[PDB]
Amino acid sequence: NFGAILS
């Protein structure tokens, strides 16, 4: 389970 958010 891996989550990544770029902004």
Place this chain on the structure above:
Amino acid sequence: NFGAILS
């Protein structure tokens, strides 16, 4: 704005 979810 870029979002990515891996599972």
Place this chain on the structure above:
Amino acid sequence: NFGAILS
């Protein structure tokens, strides 16, 4: 299960 949103 992979989800990606670009904006």
Place this chain on the structure above:
Amino acid sequence: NFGAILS
């Protein structure tokens, strides 16, 4: 605005 879902 571009969205893509892979499963």
Place this chain on the structure above:
Amino acid sequence: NFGAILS
């Protein structure tokens, strides 16, 4: 379940 909402 995958759900996405963009305004």
Place this chain on the structure above:
Amino acid sequence: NFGAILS
């Protein structure tokens, strides 16, 4: 408005 639901 853009709305999408996958299940």
Place this chain on the structure above:
Amino acid sequence: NFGAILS
């Protein structure tokens, strides 16, 4: 506004 829900 960007909203996303995964489950």
Place this chain on the structure above:
Amino acid sequence: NFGAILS
């Protein structure tokens, strides 16, 4: 459960 909200 994965949930994300961006304004």
